[PDB]
Every structure is written in C-alpha cells, then in structure tokens.
Write a protein that binds this DNA or RNA. Structure first.
Ligand SMILES: [K+]
Length: 290
DNA sequence: CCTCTGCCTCAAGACGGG
DNA sequence: GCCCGTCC
DNA sequence: ACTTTGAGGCAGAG
C-alpha cells in the first residue's frame, strides 16, 4: 500500500472518487490479486483457532473463500481474472490448489512475473479489464487508470463501491505520473523509506513546487529534514515506473462453463466439502453465466 | 497549521437457519 | 433485515 | 489472527 494515499485523495481530490451502484458494473471485467485474496482467506476463514481442513489435515480455507467469493462476483455480473504473485504464509500448494479450482470453475487466471498489483495495473492499461478490484492504492502508483474498492464487500458491511480514477487524481494534484510516483514514495511505500517530518501536506507541496525527489533533496535544509542513509528512492521510483509485468496480449482471457463432475471429485471427494453446498454453488455459477 | 507518537477500539469470508 | 453457529 | 493481528481514529506534544 501507500500510506495515507486514499485519505489524501478524499481530502484533496474527492472528485477522483466515484461511487456507483453494483448494478452499474454488470458485465464488467476486473483484475484481482489472487495471492492477497488467499492470504486474507487464511486469516478470515477460521474455526476454533485453526483453518478449515479435511480429515487428513489439509487446509481448505483458501478454497472455501475463493469458491464462494468468485460465485458472488459472477452473480453480480462481474467477471474476474485472478493474478498470482511472481518472484500465515501463502505456500505453493495454496496457489496450485486455487489454480486447479479456478480452472474447474472456468475462471481465468494469470501468473505475474513480479508484483501482482503491477500486472493488474498493466491489464487495466491495455484495456483487458475495466479496473483492478483492490484495496492496495499502490496499484494507482503502478499506473492503473482505474482502481475499485469494496467490490466484493458484503451488503451488510454497507461499504459503497468506490472507483478511483488515476487521470482525475493527476489532474487535481497538477502532477504527471512520474511526479505522482515520487509523491507516493514520500507518502510511504513498501520499497523504501520516507522523509521524517514530511507528511501528506508537505509532500504534496514539495512535489508540486520541485517536481522530483532529487530536486527536493537539493532544496531541503539537511539540518531540518535529513534523508535516510543510502536512500533507495531512485530504485523504488523505477520499480513503480517500470515494473516487471506480464504481457496483456500474451493470454486470451475467457470465462467458460464450470466442470461440475471434476469440482465434486476435487472439492468433495478430496477436500471433503459438502456435496449439497458445492452443487448449489455450481448451479448459481451456471445461472450467473445465464 | 503539520507530523509524530502513544493509546485506544474493533474488524477480520461466506452461509443458512431462527 | 440481523444474529450467530457452522462450514472443513 | 479471534486464547490474535493490525489498521485507523483520536489527543496532545513539539
Ligand atoms: K515521513
């Protein structure tokens, strides 16, 4: 994520956030970070202090969450493509099992060379999907034209679906993508440190005036705002600006009919899900394809 | 105003019966 | 609708 | 990660 970026946009560029009804997204395609969704299911889907599992002790919380959340999206007319991270722990077995489930459900997935969010952003840039459905605002820093929050949130949570439009953010802040990347570094990114004493108000002001972190460092008073030693801001800038990403043209994205017979063998025979519940889910999925 | 830091509170997936 | 036990 | 974890809201110092 980017520390304080969503709050900043709401505070200073609220017109960049559009809130629309779920019905308005019927038929839209979205990219989703599979690795993060697996991680979240391992945390959320718990019983008695442990993940759901079959009698052999093999985890199934990830399968449970992926199976029903995907069906709910398709019931809303939203077609997801899942993006797996490239180069509580998400294991290779978790990924392989979720990929197997997705293939049997007829849901496309892709392997990112590196960051899943950056490859999600690349898919939106190429027009392959409408938006990245994520809470990670760094997807904007990777250049995603549209980010959508709370798309999969249950109705009970009463969280409105929010579209963040990158072009509007840049227009309101008066910045280009390169300057926006430097601003996100000053706000606080996973890749490198931020300058102590420089928060969201001063970072926006300094980026608008000086236009680059390099220029900012020269202008700043070293005594008042010392930078961290061996600051990797040039490296982080490059990771956001030119990330290693998949080729959106490489793989054709297709949503196909689920394979109920194989889903029963895998989810019920092996993973010991209730057959009644799996068949009910498959029927909802088939109905949503209409 | 602005940015910390420390203290605090509470959500964290989906389903289905009542 | 919500509450809350259960899912595996 | 619910016999825990962590993100965010708040108040006040500097
Ligand atoms: K800082």
């Amino acid at each position: 994520g980017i520390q304080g970026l969503a709050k900043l946009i709401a505070d200073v560029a609220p017109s960049a956030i559009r809130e629309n009804d779920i019905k308005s997204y019927f038929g839209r395609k979205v990219a989703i970070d599979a690795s993060m969704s697996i991680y979240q299911f391992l945390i959320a889907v718990r019983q008695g202090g442990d993940v759901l599992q079959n009698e052999e002790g093999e985890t199934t919380s990830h399968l449970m969450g992926m199976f029903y959340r995907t069906i709910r999206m398709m019931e809303n007319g939203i077609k997801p493509v899942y993006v797996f991270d490239g180069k509580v722990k998400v294991t290779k077995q978790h990924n392989d099992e979720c990929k197997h489930l997705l293939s049997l459900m007829g849901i496309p997935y892709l392997d990112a060379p590196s960051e899943a969010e950056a490859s999600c952003a690349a898919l939106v840039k190429a027009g392959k999907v409408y938006a990245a459905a994520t809470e990670d605002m760094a997807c904007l820093t990777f250049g995603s034209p549209v980010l959508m929050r709370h798309l999969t949130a249950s109705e009970a949570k009463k969280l409105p679906i929010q579209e963040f439009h990158l072009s509007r953010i840049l227009q309101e802040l008066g910045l280009n993508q390169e300057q926006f990347v430097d601003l996100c570094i000053l706000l606080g990114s996973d890749y490198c440190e931020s300058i102590r004493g420089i928060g969201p108000k001063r970072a926006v002001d300094l980026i608008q005036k000086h236009k680059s972190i390099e220029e900012i460092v020269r202008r700043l008073d070293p005594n008042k705002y010392p930078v961290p030693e061996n600051w990797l801001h040039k490296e982080a800038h490059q990771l956001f600006l030119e990330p290693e990403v998949l080729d959106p043209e490489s793989v054709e994205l297709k949503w196909s009919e689920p394979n109920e017979e194989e889903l029963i063998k895998f989810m019920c025979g092996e993973k010991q899900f209730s057959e009644e519940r799996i068949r009910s889910g498959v029927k909802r999925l088939s109905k949503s394809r209409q």
